[PDB]
Amino acid sequence: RLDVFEKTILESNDVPGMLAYSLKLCMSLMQNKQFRNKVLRVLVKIYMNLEKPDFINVCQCLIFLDDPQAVSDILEKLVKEDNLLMAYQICFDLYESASQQFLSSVIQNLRTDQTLKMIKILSGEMAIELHLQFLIRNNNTDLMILKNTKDAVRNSVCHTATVIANSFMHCGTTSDQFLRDNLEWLARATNWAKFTATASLGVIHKGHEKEALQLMATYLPKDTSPGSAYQEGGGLYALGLIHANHGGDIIDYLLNQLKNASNDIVRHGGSLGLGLAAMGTARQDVYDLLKTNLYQDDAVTGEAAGLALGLVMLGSKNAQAIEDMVGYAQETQHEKILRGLAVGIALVMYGRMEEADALIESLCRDKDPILRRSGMYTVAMAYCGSGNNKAIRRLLHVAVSDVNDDVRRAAVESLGFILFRTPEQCPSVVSLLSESYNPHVRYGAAMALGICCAGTGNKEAINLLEPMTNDPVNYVRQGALIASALIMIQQTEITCPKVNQFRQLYSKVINDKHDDVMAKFGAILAQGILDAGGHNVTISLQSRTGHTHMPSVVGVLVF
Amino acid sequence: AVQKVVVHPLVLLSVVDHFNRIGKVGNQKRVVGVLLGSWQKKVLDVSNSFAVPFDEDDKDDSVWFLDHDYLENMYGMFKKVNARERIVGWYHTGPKLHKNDIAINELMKRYCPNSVLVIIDVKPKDLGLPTEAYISVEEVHDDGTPTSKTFEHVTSEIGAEEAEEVGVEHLLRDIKDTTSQRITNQVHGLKGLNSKLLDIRSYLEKVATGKLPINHQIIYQLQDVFNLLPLQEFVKAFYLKTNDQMVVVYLASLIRSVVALHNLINNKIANRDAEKKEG
Amino acid sequence: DLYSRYKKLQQELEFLEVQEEYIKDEQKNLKKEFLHAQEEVKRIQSIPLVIGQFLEAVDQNTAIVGSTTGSNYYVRILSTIDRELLKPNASVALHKHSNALVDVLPPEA
Amino acid sequence: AVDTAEQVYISSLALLKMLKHGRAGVPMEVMGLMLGEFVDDYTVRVIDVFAMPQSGTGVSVEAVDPVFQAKMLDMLKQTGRPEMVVGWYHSHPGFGCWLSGVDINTQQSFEALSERAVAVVVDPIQSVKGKVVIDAFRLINANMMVLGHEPRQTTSNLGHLNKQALIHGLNRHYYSITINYRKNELEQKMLLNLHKKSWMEGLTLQDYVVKEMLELAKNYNKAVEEEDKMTPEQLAIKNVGKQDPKRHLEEHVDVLMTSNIVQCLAAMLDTVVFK
Amino acid sequence: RPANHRQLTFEEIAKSAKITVNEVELLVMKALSVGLVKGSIDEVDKRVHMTWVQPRVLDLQQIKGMKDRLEFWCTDVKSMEMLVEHQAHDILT
Amino acid sequence: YLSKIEELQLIVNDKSQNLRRLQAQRNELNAKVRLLREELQLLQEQGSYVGEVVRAMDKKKVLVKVHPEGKFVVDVDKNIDINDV
Ligand SMILES: [Zn+2]
């Protein structure tokens, strides 16, 4: 109750920064949305009541209290008070940690020298291109591993995780090296190595926004000249890769490429690309043409429809996206189309934290482990952090008591999303989860170690994974591979002494030729994630600003 | 006269898929087809049968279509496959009946000397057992009018002639060998109770609007088997049960004290071992 | 901090108690599975028990055993058999194709 | 380029037909023609299977009977489903049930006649509950040797598929396809409803056997517990003498539980039902 | 009389059945030959015991007012089923 | 003191969490014994018999007295060395 609260924020002299760390500590013991926004909007106003104004308060209340008009008021204070140099917190946290839907609404509310730097902070391209400058200048390769993993290329991960490796190293190097060094290794292309051999250009060209079209001058949609549409569809997917979250007209131009009277041969990659491009912007036209993509009755573009429509309707609470995508779910005659629609209707409701309970109960009501798996993805996205036991009791019930291991796998992927905040207790619960009896859930426990403890300095997770790669199931050995790559991001040998052990050990187990290539399937990918950036970059599932970074969450859960 | 036949769920699945057929081809509602069987004895097997393309006109249920090329002709091709499961009867969906069932079964009576019609269930919602069989009967009355042939409840049960659950079991993915008693108890109770409710409502109808079958032929002897125990003063049975529960509690006491001692000794042994010999 | 540290003591005990709960229902589930296993232990078997004879054991519940068909074999045995009972060339009994020893019988012939 | 991670949408009823005919056919193998649909590429669907004439045949291709198929198809068109045959069915109830010679003849003699006509083999004798012994394969021919063969257009289907003496000695020409059962709830409902209702005392108002059973039960209980009771005499392993404790003290208690449990149950049901 | 005292004395028999004490035995042994009632008749107290009988033809007023036995049975065995299950309620398990 | 005693004692009640650690040990034992029971699918195919071997030789080969048959040089495994035979 705000009576003693108001007398003890209008109280007498201590450090006022008591209240500043008390913002995060009230947020640490917060249970509801009911006095969270109350305390959140009255501490910023008691900083407006104290004579010294504050900026960490608006840096936090823009991303927890979502007021696009109070930032317009103190941005008129940024134009009037004129100090851009104190303005950095609100300006580039508004660029950094803001929801893209809130970004569009806040550039709507804001525009009513900083006269144009008020638009230049919101576009915020300066950090993008000097980040790109870092991604071209810094490098540390290991090409001998690239050859001794290139020995086992197929229609497989090697053809994709070589470019994933030196493209997570280099998100936009704008330079060819795997195109340059060979063509016959590039000539193992069949529909997904074809899709990848034309999508990998935009894989290795993340960012670098203007030269997208004129760098894929070769990859306009009549300039491939191939006896197959995937070698021209993954290119427009690669345009969608480049045009992530900052389009302009090229969002509408991939939209028009889909609407240049072309059915399911351009859409092959271009629909994935378009949904990736207009992600969270809540458009109308992409929903209008993805309704006939939804009713294609062909899941090779229909899963692209479901996925891309969930992408363009991120956390929507639409009265027609939710209902008109759950409607097509039941009467379809496949269920990989239901994987597509599954992750789509998961992404359509993100972080609502009490709203989606009707949908979760309605979908876990049903009997389908794929549709209940959809419900577990959707409760991973509606709930992340809010362990109110509403999203734990029945979640854990269906997580570990159920009969089919795929919905159990999605539930142990949900655990890593609801347990980001305090990864201290997460070894004590996922080492318990380790004890599972079944292949998918052994692997899913490994994935819970991975996506839960991404940025941690845990050694017990490595201690878990070492018998998990001492396991006759080959892909739980790759679970150990990829999850340990996710424990060996961001950290060096001085952090834990198993880093270089596993670095040389993964090449050591790829020396064994008689292992499954499913056992070393993501071994090239474990090397690539093992140098994601080259330890230059890291995951952002919960940013240091205080607020979660939702397209990274999208990336990992669809990943 | 048949007390039971092998109700093999394979013919059940045939019935179900052809009910899906009659539902998806249009609006032909009452699933009706020919039941095939091999008369071993009063006992019989129903594992093979089929639906016949037939239609029933809305009025005059005595409307039917039994192609000889889809039955007699097929029978010869099926005769080279397996002569055992001979033409034995037929079936109909729809809960109570229609008017043609008797005429249909008597038409096919030439094929099987004891031909059967079966009220088949298209929606398993029953308290108990699905579709049952009704053979030709001559049961007119004490009046003894021209012999009615409304085929009486010729009891049977779900015969699983062979296991063949190599796949069937492989379909359940739900149950165990329930070492369940409570399930049986609630089912039995509520089923007796709803049955009795159907009874009392039927008899209130009998008093109110029920026909001459109000106490037709056995409803009074129905009440007589009720009159098996017509407080029933089971005092003989009371001290009988007193000694019975002497036995019951002797069992309980002795056996469960044995159980007590049993877990006690070795569970405590392992307990204390891992407890103090660990430190 | 009495209005922070002390309060923070519940920030994790809730999930603690939830998992302490779930260990019970999973005890239940694993018990179900173990009963399933014990069921599948001996339901196909012991009906067409072919007879050979033990000859020599190599490792745990695995032995080279003289046949009565024409080919001695080195097969595994049901481990629950008392390890001090596979010493004689007594009337062992196995499956036809699997030739998996189920138990040994003392008498014969 | 059908190189994929493929699928077959079986119909459990056809599985029932196969078990029905091979379970008690001649000791030899049986073979027939499918009735389904080449619905797609990366999967396929099956619905119907007819029984086959008894002509002396095998896995031979030339076992065709014209009038049989003609009348069968004409009746099916007169029946509900006039859908097209797309393959063939067969079994190997006799031997170790793998893709024998005439299979590696008929599968190509018909996969050109058909498009895929994936293998269908099953030996009912090899399992009743334990295994689901059945075989199914898409034949490969010597023409597809163009490129290194790893279809795997999706993974963990051919990945989970990674989990036969002469047929794994014949992986060439024999690559297996991921199979599955249909969404059978349409019947699975009536495949458990009628089952559970009957397999469990039907009416269930029957044993509600209760004395003669527990007489023998307790009668043998006094005779059974007195040997496991000799194990503590064998648990006389005082100083250092105990290997495995002969952990067989159980396997009687639970039975005793059930026994007196049911005793109390029936004691209840007496006063409950009787009035 | 639905009620008990099914070890009836011979008195109503010898009064309203126009029979004597020496002939109640023939009255029920001829009924043993008939076969609709087979009493275990007392002969130390001379009581004519009632066992199972062949009841009636029609009691339409009791076909309507058998509710005091039928609905009695229905709701009371139902209620005591609910009571047994309600005392063993949370071992639903 | 005033409102700072009870949750410390609640963390003390994580001896019940230690009880969960005990039941965790339990379900470990049970799950892995059941894994042992799962292993038994290996027991359905081949109790491979003892083939005699006159002697070893190179080319990864031996002279196996196939006991109810003749001698037929056949394949080996990749575990033991040639001299081991
Ligand atoms: Zn065959």
CSV table of C-alpha atoms and ligand atoms in Angstrom, one decimal, chain D residues 29-30 90-92, ligand 1:
chain,number,residue,atom,x,y,z
D,29,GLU,CA,4.8,-66.7,-47.1
D,30,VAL,CA,1.9,-64.7,-48.5
D,90,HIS,CA,3.2,-59.5,-48.5
D,91,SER,CA,4.5,-61.5,-45.5
D,92,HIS,CA,7.2,-64.0,-44.6
G,1,ZN,ZN,6.7,-63.9,-48.4
